[PDB]
Design a protein around this ligand. Structure first.
Ligand SMILES: [Mg+2]
Ligand SMILES: [Mg+2]
Lengths: 205, 33, 206, 38, 28, 27, 91, 49, 247, 62, 134, 128, 42
RNA sequence: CGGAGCCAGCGAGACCUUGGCCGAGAGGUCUUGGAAACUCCGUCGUGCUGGGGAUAGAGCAUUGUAAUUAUUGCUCUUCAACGAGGAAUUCCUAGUAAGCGCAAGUCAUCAGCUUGCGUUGAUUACGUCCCUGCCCUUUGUACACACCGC
């Protein structure tokens, strides 16, 4: 649904052919294309904001799509999935190109650097990996498993140290300077890392 | 299957079955003479 | 002031040649040619003639055909080697291209004491046509740096190949002579002649 | 002797003429077996 | 046997996974 | 009707087997 | 259809969605009791989530992603049996 | 038969030349066992096969 | 991931079996594979060939591409059938068409419908390519009108449904291009004409290519699966083979 | 002497001939002064062209 | 601890071929100057003097790699392409080479057929392998 | 038990299995020294990991690599991938985590295909 | 709710004259319904 | 051209074979069980030349079959057309073009042909509607904003 926050009205509703459950969303910088992803379809649906019609379905992910984001400047679309891969879509233009980059593990979260030149992904192995979008190569990595604080649940029959329930971050975001990432997940910690130095700035309970 | 099988699994199992339907010894003598 | 990261002399159960324990210090092409001093003389060709990442051998199995300008990031020696395998009978045989390039670099060092990689870079810089024609008659236009690099590699390799196609000269020695002449800028090289002809035709129709 | 299988047909002018008569009648009546939007 | 080879779950787990010529026979 | 059906623009020789078949029918 | 829900819906149908029951059908566990012990011990994940509640009912979309947790000593045993245990994955 | 590839087999001694085979291509045939077959094509080498 | 495909095959085979019983009970609509998207989503078609095609098969593959409005030609160099099918599923392709030849003569044509089938195999006869016409000109690529003639048996309805959905839904009423599939004793004649409505009838001009196709196999699965259940197969050695008709 | 000019804009919908692109370039010597040129190869912003003549102004080549 | 595996294949074969020629005890058949080593070849070996000894060194190294070897395996091993046939090498030369080596004691009749690397021969090969390093 | 790890490297049909255990710097491929790996013109490829991180890290380990399948080039790439992954895994399991991170950073900065499998899965570039 | 609890990874809370107060409103109080209409609508 | 080094993946309805001995080879005889391309070192050297192997002669053998019949291989000698292809023309964007071998003939088609399998692996473009051709629109109808206005 599109909401006009000057007049506080839902002026348009977008839906698939078969009632797909959407988990993630991305909007073009021009505000003319909106994209959504699902845990059950593996295809990224694209609509026209002005018309509300399905343009087409970006296909290529083998696993459910976890997260989407347009570059605020370059207007490229990055999608990551439990397929252990990230795909960069050049949907605008006379020709469509896709660039898949492999990752060691399922991708849970994704963030576009405000410059639009790099993308960070958080994986299930507890890693934050930074890739250069134009060259499609990794430029940095951060470990996060040791920094994360997770408590033993009262129902647990295994210790917290041995526990692996949530030692990854399900959400990450760049600072608008581009030098920091704030991360959180299904745990009792919000970790703030410094991207260029790949060190933890601070941890919040 | 302690709790049974669903309809698709029952169809699958039936299909597979049809295709499927389609101390002297212990010892040994050595150094014979 | 000193920094020491190793307190024990390293001898491995598997013997390794000494030249390799020299290679660990710096990456050199074929463990014989350094990229440290190589510079592209022409400013425009910088960012399209990549010599900043050293490589031991041309074979890299890289992905450069995916996106429009990835070829700019490919090492220039590897682009030369790839251009070296054509005319059908040589399609797909890249080890021979690598060996021929190795022999050519040895020849270039032998004739001229200057660094052969620098000779290759200077030849590619000199033999890039800066202005061309398009069929309207003809009309003169400028040429993109990537097109200059592509045409330079194509002209050098094609001239070398045609020179030794039916001659006692081998592919390696004729490639060395072509590169040396192009670096000198002498008209002897076929590529320099073609570049001058293209620019003259364009100037006529300017 | 007998043959095991149907012979491959031969496209003679009469076969064409009869076929194009079927096509022309179908276009005349606008009788097309073509998919339609649901 | 070809489907069983095809649709095999790699996560399947079983506890069993944890576990003179005359003279040679005579010696063994 | 005859000009606009090249298969019986003109087709290359050998595409049609009408001449052979009609001879067999006469025989 | 609505009519079939009168008779199709049965307790056995719901019991079949039970995580230990799904695990047994997947051959991950030899017996339902074995599956419950593994779930309690934290060796089982449904998607990116570790599930330690044997009472959890698996939806059809998530059925494909029930697997062993990466560092489980069990999953090491499976790979070791095949001689396919790759230490770079830490599993 | 002298060469058998599952359903395909090469047959000899029925015909003396490939020109006789051409007349009977597509003919019905059978074995003494009753397996039915067809004359597909004449082998150029040797004659009659 | 293989797990989802393994599950969906069991559901697909179960659905076809059930649909067969309901049909037989009715004996005493659009097929389940096409039912979801029939008239909703236009097809995405890939036309490929066997490995190392001759120049003629490539020319014929280009002509089959122009027959279908939403078809794209792909080079098959070194591609493996599991990878070719898996790549097509990833890319949203709906139907895959593979062509075979013998010394530059098209011999066979197989159609596989994604994600789960069916796979239909034809044999090509009397193929006359538009390259065999001099000064032919360029085709018209509008959504054509379809004619399916003399398809009566349930298998004939199955064949029509498979071929019908290779085209887009809803051609314009005044579209001047018509593609005809005429069944004549199980030999489907395929012609392509452009017509002009005259003041006393209709005049048609043939575009090409010409060929006859005869179905000889139809399986419940994609072309990669050689173990797929056979929905229908053509018996050649039965004693009524030389006169029996099926479509 | 030959001048160097960096591309700042790839002009679109110019009606140019196939294979030719119309671009706007700024001279390195004088960053402000700009000229419109016709280029032949694949061109993008921020790349430098060697102009043999700096006085000619590009005209559409159809 | 030096082994034939520690040495480059050609370097060992060149060194051990020279040793056999220098040793002079290897029996060489009279026809070595008239044969091609394979009917797929067009010419005899150019190194007429020492190609046989080099064959012996090459064969002896293969015995060390693989414990049991026979003439049939050597024929395919030294065979090559000629449609094509992939004809196997000449059986006469390989049989003579195997018979000549075991006169020196380098190899000997393996049980269940074939030739084994003799323990005296194994030290002899390892001796020359250490020579190449040193 | 002696500490050890084992890893796999792949390239097309070529598969290399590396065993990295505590030792004295004995690096072998198919039972022979890595210095004998052929073709010689691509030998430095298998040297690339060793030279990037230094021979200093190998002085305390023994690596045994067994390669099967594929061709000469693909086997070279499988060998280098397996060696790099084996070194990283060994430093993870039996050495500190900081050294593992440094190794990953160096290998990734030089050539990511040393660590992540390079599979050119078919892609219908033409949408449609 | 009952089915959600069984198939939910995380906790699921149980769902919940005189003039009545509306605690939650679809628009700001200062905003008027007239200002919610476009000129084309009027 | 001569040596030497070596790396695949498809494939299972007596005949296969590991091994010994003869023969230069082709191929014989006596017994057991049921890949090329490519890389290294050498010879040759711009000469229709150590490129090419058609035609022809002489021999050594295999296979049936009953003939001095062909069949299929091997050895030597003989040593041609062919010097990169006219007017025109077909195709083609990444594991792609092209090179290389191997296997199976699994109801149509295919028999040195059909299909599959792996090995080696690029140049160029990935922009434009300027030309050609094929289409679409010229009642916004389209839910806010903005833009547009027969
Ligand atoms: Mg090809
Ligand atoms: Mg073919």
């Amino acid at each position: 649904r599109a909401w006009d926050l000057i007049r506080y009205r839902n002026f348009r509703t977008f839906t698939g052919t078969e009632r797909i459950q959407f988990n993630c969303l991305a909007v073009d910088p021009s505000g003319e294309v909106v994209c959504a992803g699902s845990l059950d379809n593996f295809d990224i649906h694209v609509w026209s904001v002005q018309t509300g019609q399905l343009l087409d379905a970006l296909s290529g992910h083998e696993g459910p799509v976890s997260c989407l984001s347009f570059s605020q400047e370059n207007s490229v679309l990055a999608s990551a999935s439990w397929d252990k891969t990230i795909r960069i879509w050049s949907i605008f233009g006379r020709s469509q190109q896709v660039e898949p980059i492999e990752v060691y593990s399922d991708v849970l979260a994704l963030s576009m650097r405000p410059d639009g030149k790099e993308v960070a992904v958080s994986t299930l192995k507890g890693q934050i990996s930074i890739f250069n979008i134009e060259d499609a190569k990794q430029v940095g990595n951060i470990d996060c498993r040791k920094d994360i604080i997770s408590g033993r649940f009262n129902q647990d029959r295994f210790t917290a140290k041995n526990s692996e329930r949530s030692k990854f971050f399900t959400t990450i975001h760049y600072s608008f300077d581009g030098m920091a990432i704030v991360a959180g997940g299904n745990n009792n910690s919000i970790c703030l890392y410094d991207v260029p130095n790949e060190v933890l700035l601070k941890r919040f309970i | 299957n302690p709790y049974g099988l669903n309809e698709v699994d029952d169809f699958a199992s039936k299909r597979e079955k049809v295709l499927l339907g389609q101390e002297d010894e212990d010892e040994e003598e050595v150094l014979a003479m | 002031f000193e920094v020491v990261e190793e307190f024990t002399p390293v001898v491995l159960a598997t013997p390794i040649p000494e030249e390799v324990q020299q290679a660990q210090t710096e990456i050199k092409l074929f463990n014989k040619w350094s990229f440290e001093e190589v510079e592209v003389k022409d400013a425009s060709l910088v960012d399209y003639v990549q010599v900043r990442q050293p490589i031991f051998v041309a074979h890299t199995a890289g992905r450069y055909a995916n996106k429009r300008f990835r070829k700019a990031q490919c090492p220039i020696i590897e682009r030369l080697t790839n251009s070296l395998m054509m005319n059908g009978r040589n399609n797909g045989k890249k080890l021979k291209a690598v060996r021929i390039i190795k022999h050519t670099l040895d020849i270039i060092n032998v004739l001229t004491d200057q660094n052969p990689i620098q000779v290759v870079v200077d030849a590619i810089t000199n033999t890039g046509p800066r202005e061309d024609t398009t069929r309207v008659r003809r009309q003169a236009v400028d040429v993109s740096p990537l097109r200059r690099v592509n045409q330079a590699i194509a002209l050098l390799t094609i001239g070398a190949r045609e020179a030794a196609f039916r001659n006692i000269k081998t592919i390696a020695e004729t490639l060395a002579e072509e590169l040396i002449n192009a670096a000198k800028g002498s008209s002897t090289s076929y590529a320099i002649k073609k570049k001058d002809e293209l620019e003259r035709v364009a100037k006529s129709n300017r | 002797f007998d043959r095991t299988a149907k012979p491959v047909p031969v496209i003679t002018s009469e076969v064409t003429e009869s076929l194009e008569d079927m096509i022309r009648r179908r276009i005349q009546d606008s009788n097309f077996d073509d998919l339609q939007r649901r | 046997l070809r489907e069983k080879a095809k649709e095999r779950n790699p996560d399947e787990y079983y506890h069993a996974m944890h576990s003179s010529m005359d003279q040679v026979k005579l010696l063994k | 009707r005859e000009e606009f059906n090249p298969f019986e623009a003109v087709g290359k020789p050998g595409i049609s087997k009408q001449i052979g078949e009609e001879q067999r029918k006469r025989a | 259809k609505i009519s079939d829900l009168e008779n199709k819906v049965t307790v056995s149908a719901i019991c079949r969605r039970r995580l230990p029951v799904i695990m047994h059908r997947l051959k991950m566990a030899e017996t339902i009791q074995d599956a419950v012990k593994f779930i309690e011990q934290g060796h089982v994940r449904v998607g990116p989530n570790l599930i330690n509640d044997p009472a959890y009912l698996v939806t059809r979309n998530m059925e494909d992603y029930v697997t062993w947790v990466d560092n489980s000593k069990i999953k090491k045993t499976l790979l070791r049996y095949r001689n396919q245990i790759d230490d770079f994955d830490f599993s | 038969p002298y060469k058998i590839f599952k359903n395909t087999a090469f047959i000899k001694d029925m015909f003396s030349s490939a020109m006789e085979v051409a007349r009977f291509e597509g003919a019905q045939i059978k074995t003494v066992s009753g397996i039915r077959g067809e004359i597909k094509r004449a082998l150029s080498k040797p004659e009659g096969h | 991931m293989l797990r989802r495909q393994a599950r969906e095959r069991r559901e697909y085979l179960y659905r076809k079996a059930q649909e067969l019983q309901d049909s037989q009970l009715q004996q005493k609509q659009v097929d389940d594979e096409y039912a979801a998207t029939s008239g909703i989503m236009d097809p995405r078609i890939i036309v490929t060939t066997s490995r190392d095609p001759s120049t003629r098969l490539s020319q014929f593959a280009k002509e089959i591409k122009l027959l279908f409005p939403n078809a794209v030609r792909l080079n098959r160099g070194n591609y493996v059938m599991p990878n070719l099918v898996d790549a097509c599923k990833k890319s949203g392709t709906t139907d895959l068409v593979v062509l075979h030849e013998h010394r530059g003569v098209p011999t066979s044509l197989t159609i596989s419908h994604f994600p789960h089938g069916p796979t239909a195999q034809f044999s090509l006869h009397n193929v006359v390519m538009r390259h065999d016409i001099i000064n032919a000109g360029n085709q018209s690529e509008v959504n054509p009108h379809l004619i399916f003639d003399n398809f009566t048996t349930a298998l004939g309805k199955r064949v029509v449904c498979i071929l019908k959905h290779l085209f887009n839904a809803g051609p314009k009423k005044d579209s001047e291009r018509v593609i005809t599939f005429a069944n004549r004793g199980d030999f489907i004649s395929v012609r392509q004409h452009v017509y002009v409505r005259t003041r006393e009838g209709v005049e048609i001009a043939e575009v090409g290519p010409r060929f006859e196709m005869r179905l000889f196999e139809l399986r419940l699965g994609t072309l990669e699966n050689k173990d797929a259940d056979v929905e229908w197969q053509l018996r050649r050695f039965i004693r009524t083979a030389n006169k029996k008709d099926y479509l | 002497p030959v001048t160097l000019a960096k591309v700042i804009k790839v002009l679109g919908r110019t009606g140019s001939r196939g294979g030719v692109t119309q671009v706007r370039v700024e001279f390195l010597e004088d960053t402000s002064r700009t000229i419109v040129r016709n280029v032949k190869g694949p061109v993008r912003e921020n790349d430098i062209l060697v102009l043999m003549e700096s006085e000619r102004e590009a005209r559409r080549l159809r | 601890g030096v082994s034939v595996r520690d040495v480059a294949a050609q370097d060992f074969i060149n060194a051990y071929a020279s040793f056999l020629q220098r040793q002079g005890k290897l029996e060489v058949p009279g026809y070595v100057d008239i044969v091609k080593t394979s009917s797929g070849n067009e010419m005899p070996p150019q190194d007429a003097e020492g190609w046989f000894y080099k064959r012996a060194a090459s064969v002896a190294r293969h015995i060390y790699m693989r414990k049991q070897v026979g003439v049939g395996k050597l024929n395919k091993l030294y065979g090559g392409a000629k449609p094509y046939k992939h004809i196997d090498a000449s059986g006469s030369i390989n049989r003579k080479v195997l018979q000549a080596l075991e006169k020196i004691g380098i190899v000997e009749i393996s049980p269940k057929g074939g030739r084994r690397i003799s323990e005296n021969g194994q030290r002899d090969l390892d001796r020359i392998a250490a020579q190449t390093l040193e | 038990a002696v500490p050890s790890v084992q890893t796999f490297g792949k390239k097309k049909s070529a598969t290399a299995v590396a065993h990295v255990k505590a030792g004295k710097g004995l690096i072998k491929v198919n039972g022979s020294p890595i210095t004998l790996v052929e073709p010689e013109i691509l030998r430095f490829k298998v040297y690339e990991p060793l030279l990037l991180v230094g021979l200093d890290k190998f002085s305390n380990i023994d690596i045994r690599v067994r390669v099967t399948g594929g061709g000469h080039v693909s086997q070279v790439y499988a060998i280098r991938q397996a060696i790099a992954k084996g070194l990283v895994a060994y430093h993870q399991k039996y050495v500190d985590e900081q050294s593992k991170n440094e190794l990953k950073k160096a290998f990734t900065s030089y050539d990511r295909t040393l660590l992540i499998a390079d599979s050119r899965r078919p892609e219908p570039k033409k949408f449609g | 709710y009952k089915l959600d609890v069984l198939s939910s990874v995380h906790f699921v809370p149980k769902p919940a004259e005189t003039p009545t107060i509306s605690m939650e409103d679809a628009q700001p109080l200062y905003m008027s319904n007239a200002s919610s209409l476009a000129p084309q609508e009027i």
